[PDB]
Amino acid sequence: PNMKIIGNRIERIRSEHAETWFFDENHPYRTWAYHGSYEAPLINGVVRLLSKPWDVVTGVTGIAGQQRVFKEKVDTRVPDPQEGTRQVMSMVSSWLWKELGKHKRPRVCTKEEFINKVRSVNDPRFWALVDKEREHHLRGECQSCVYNMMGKRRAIWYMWLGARFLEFEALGFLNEDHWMGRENSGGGVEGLGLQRLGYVLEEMSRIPGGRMYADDGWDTRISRFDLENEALITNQMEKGHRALALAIIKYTYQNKVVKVLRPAEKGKTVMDIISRQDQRGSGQVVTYALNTFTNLVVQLIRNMEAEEVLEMQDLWLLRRSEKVTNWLQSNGWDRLKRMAVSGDDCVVKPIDDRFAHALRFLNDMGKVRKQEWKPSTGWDNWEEVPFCSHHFNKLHLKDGRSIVVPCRHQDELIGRARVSPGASIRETACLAKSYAQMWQLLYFHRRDLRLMANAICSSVPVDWVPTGRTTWSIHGKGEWMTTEDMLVVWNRVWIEENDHMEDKTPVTKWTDIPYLGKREDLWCGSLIGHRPRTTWAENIKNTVNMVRRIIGDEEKYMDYLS
Ligand SMILES: [Zn+2]
Ligand SMILES: [Zn+2]
């Protein structure tokens, strides 16, 4: 640990818990530096009532401790890549940042931009704390950019709103100005809705070359070298902005301080203060953009190895750099356009199948696939390629026009809709309406979801505005968060604004909108034809009437089932 960089944050924590602070010599940390400890102190009813057949489906109910996740997934370490691998990583990262910044200029994001963003802070004492920490950063110090780690048995790293603002201020431009958008990056998909991703995969399937590869703990494999290469963006910044960004990179990214809970004696709990120089601090403002960046660099490197630009001699030391520069200048852009990269999620269409066994740089970089030396298996059919937890299928409207829709196992969709965050009928009903409308826009092709969504919408007052979050994904554009008629919204998304729908004829009725074939719907978890589901569908109007009774029969409801 670099005590000159992390000491101030450790001292601040100790000062807030001076009387309970202690050093636990029997702490369980092996690859994280340990500094000390101190003493430390649901179901959406509306959706559950309307999804009785899924009460007995573990795939659904299972979706509804921290130390275990830490020891197994976060408390690990791997060797440094060799010198040549590190030179290649730096050269490709420098080239990529220059390409991304050719038609964009870095900028400081404003206090006002952050305020308008949170309405999806009003106290001036918060901004006084924010200004104070900023002043420490400009002097070369950090007092409060500390993570609170929350394990889900993956690891979620939380930081106070002030630290997130300082990060947004210095690096938010990457998101706000769409540096990782497809137009700017070739391989990125930032800003695209789930409704567009299938068309990207289909376009890639037509590029001549090998099979489509979609090889998947990414955040734990980000090295200190990846972090340094990500930091090369500061070279494109003007002095003032650069000072703010270098401080975020130093304290939030490269010299992290984390608070983690641990069980103690006789039902009590302790908080541990630990530190780590590498790995990604999951859930930060630009985590997604930086993961996309580094994943693009990794895929370009894998393509250079596959194409025999990089030889086995180059892992140890890269003697000549000209071959790499010539490949990047000649082919870099063509290779980026053969990718779809969304953070840690990637699909690649290489020029041939040598990519499958191009594993020497990949493994030396510590970017191990989810056997280490077994060649990757590519996909011949783009409709089966996994991307962002979905696969994408071509269906046809009643009039014959094709559409490409997103799909995933239905248990995941229903399981997520049954989760309600925080301990009222108003809030649960408005959140159920958000899920139902999301399903009408994107998963209309699933029989059980079209019916369940219509039952939910028929059970919630028509004038109640959808609220809450139905997804964390950047590909969730929230078009369903509205009281506008969902057939109108469906037409806007799938016909009007869909650049892959040549004929702009509107669709006038839901019956013209297809379902998957029965075989595919069943493969992806449909309970169609299963007796408890048949009973649920036959009884659905009575179930809707029961929910209307609970919410209030005085409210105005619409029958979306009729
Ligand atoms: Zn700080
Ligand atoms: Zn499917």
Angle at the Cα of 432 from the Cα atoms of 43 and 395, rounded to 5 degrees:
120
CB within 8 A of 355, min separation 6: which ones? 210, 213, 302, 303, 306, 348, 376, 378
Binding residues: 133, 137, 142, 145, 391, 407, 524
Best CA proximity match to 120, nearest among 410, 449, 466: 466
Q: Are residues 436 and 289 in the same domain?
A: no
**Distance from Cα 235 to the centre of ligand 1, integer Å:** 21
Q: Are strands 147-151 and 256-263 parallel, antiparallel or unpaired?
A: parallel
Q: Domain containing 16: what range?
A: 1-41+65-76+143-157+254-277
Strand (E) or helix (H) holding 448: helix 447-459
Report how far residue 558's alpha carbon sits from residue 562's, in angstroms, rounded to the nearest whole number. Answer: 9
Same domain, 298 and 337: yes
Give the pairing of strands 147-151 and 345-348. Answer: unpaired
Q: State in Å: Cα 217 to ligand 1 middle.
A: 27
CA distance 380 to 382: 7
CB 391 within 8 A of CB 407: yes
Q: Which ligand is nearest to the CA of 407?
A: 2
Distance 393 CA to ligand 2 centre (A): 7
Which ligand is nearest to the Cα of residue 165, counting in written order? 1
| Cα 384 to averaged position of ligand 2 atoms, centre (Å) | 9
Nearest in space to 275 (alpha carbons), one of 41, 20, 29:
29
Final residue before a domain boundary, out of 338, 360, 388: 388
Which DSSP string corresponds to 351-409? SSGGGGG--HHHHHTT-----TTSPPPPBS-GGG--BTTBEEEEEE-TTS-EEEEEE--
Same domain, 220 and 271: no
Question: Where is the domain boundary, 334, 365, 388?
Answer: 388
Instruction: Report the C-alpha gap between 311 and 537 in whole angstroms.
Output: 61
Instruction: Kindly provide the b/e burial profile for residues 166-195, where b requires at least 16 CB atoms within 10 angstroms of the residue's own CB.
Output: bbbbbbbbbbeebbbbbebbbbbbbbbbbb
Q: Report CA(253)–ligand 1 centroid distance (Å).
A: 11
Whether 438 contacts 84, CB under 8 Å = no
Same domain membership, residue 10 and residue 149: yes
- Asked whether the beta carbons of 432 and 464 are under 8 A apart, the reply is no
Cross-strand pairs, 151? 155
Ligand nearest to the CA of 159: 1
Type and span of the H or E element at 539: helix 531-551
Domain final residue, candidates 243, 277, 311:
277
Residues 271 and 210 both lie in one domain? no
Stretch (H or E) spanning 346: strand 345-348
The structure tokens listed for 222 are 């980000």
Query: Is the Cβ–Cβ distance between 148 and 282 less than 8 Å?
Result: no
Which residues sit in the known binding site for Zn(2+)? 133, 137, 142, 145, 391, 407, 524
Q: Please give the full DSSP string across 26-84, using - where no structure is assigned.
A: T---SSSEEEEEEEE--B-HHHHHT-GGGTT-HHHHTT--HHHHIIIIIS---PPPPHH
Classify residue 335 as left (phi > 0), alpha (psi -120 to 50) or beta. alpha
User: Separation of 503 CA from ligand 1 center, angstroms?
Assistant: 53
DSSP 8-state secondary structure symbol assigned to residue 144: S
Q: Are residues 222 and 263 located together in one domain of the fold?
A: no
- 446 Cα: distance to centroid of ligand 2 (angstroms): 9
Distance CA 135, CA 156 (A): 28
Buried b (16+ CB within 10 A) or exposed e, 462-480: eebebebebeebbbbbbbb
CA distance 175 to 359: 31
Q: Which residues contact 41 (CB under 8 A, 6 or more apart)?
A: 269
Based on the domain organization, do 356 and 393 belong to the same domain? no
d(CA 158, ligand 1 centre) in Å: 14
Q: Are 114 and 179 found together in one domain?
A: no
Tally of structural domains, the chain: 4
Please give the torsion angle defined by the CA atoms of residues 189, 191, 194 and 199, in that order, rounded to the nearest 10 degrees: -50
Residue 347 CB contacts under 8 Å (≥ 6 apart), including other chains: 201, 204, 212, 213, 214, 339, 340, 341, 385, 387
Is there a single domain that holds both residue 528 and residue 393?
yes
What's the gap in Å between 539 CA and the centre of ligand 1? Answer: 57
Three-class SS of residue 560? coil
Cα 81 to middle of ligand 1, angstroms:
30
Tokens of residue 213, six digits:
């590869």
Nearest partner of 16 among 302, 397, 271, judged by Cα: 271
Q: Do 292 and 360 lie in a common domain?
A: yes
Nearest ligand by distance to the CA of 244? 1
Ligand nearest to C-alpha 524: 2
Q: Are strands 256-263 and 269-276 parallel, antiparallel or unpaired?
A: antiparallel
Q: Answer yes or no: do 376 and 426 share one domain.
A: no
What is the 407 CA–ligand 2 centroid distance (Å)? 4
Residues 377, 402 within the same domain: no
Strand partners, 256: 276
